[PDB]
Amino acid sequence: GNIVAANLNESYDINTLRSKSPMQWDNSSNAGFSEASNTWLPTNSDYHTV
């Protein structure tokens, strides 16, 4: 699903950022997309079940 449009300090379209959230693999931190602390966009909150 979509995310809620967060604050980005790069020039992005806030109307269409909702479809660009990181891919949801396994239920790790950042849904297995990254082992970094913070990603460039927030992972959707339903990643534990989806």
Ligand SMILES: *[C@@H]1O[C@H](CO)[C@@H](O[C@@H]2O[C@H](CO)[C@@H](O)[C@H](O)[C@H]2NC(C)=O)[C@H](O)[C@H]1NC(C)=O
């Ligand atoms: C844009 O990036 C962040 C938010 O996306 C801005 O705020 C910093 O966020 C980091 C993340 O934890 C904090 O540690 C800093 O204290 C924040 N404040 C700063 C750096 O003043 C950040 O200010 C923005 N960077 C720009 C505009 O260059």
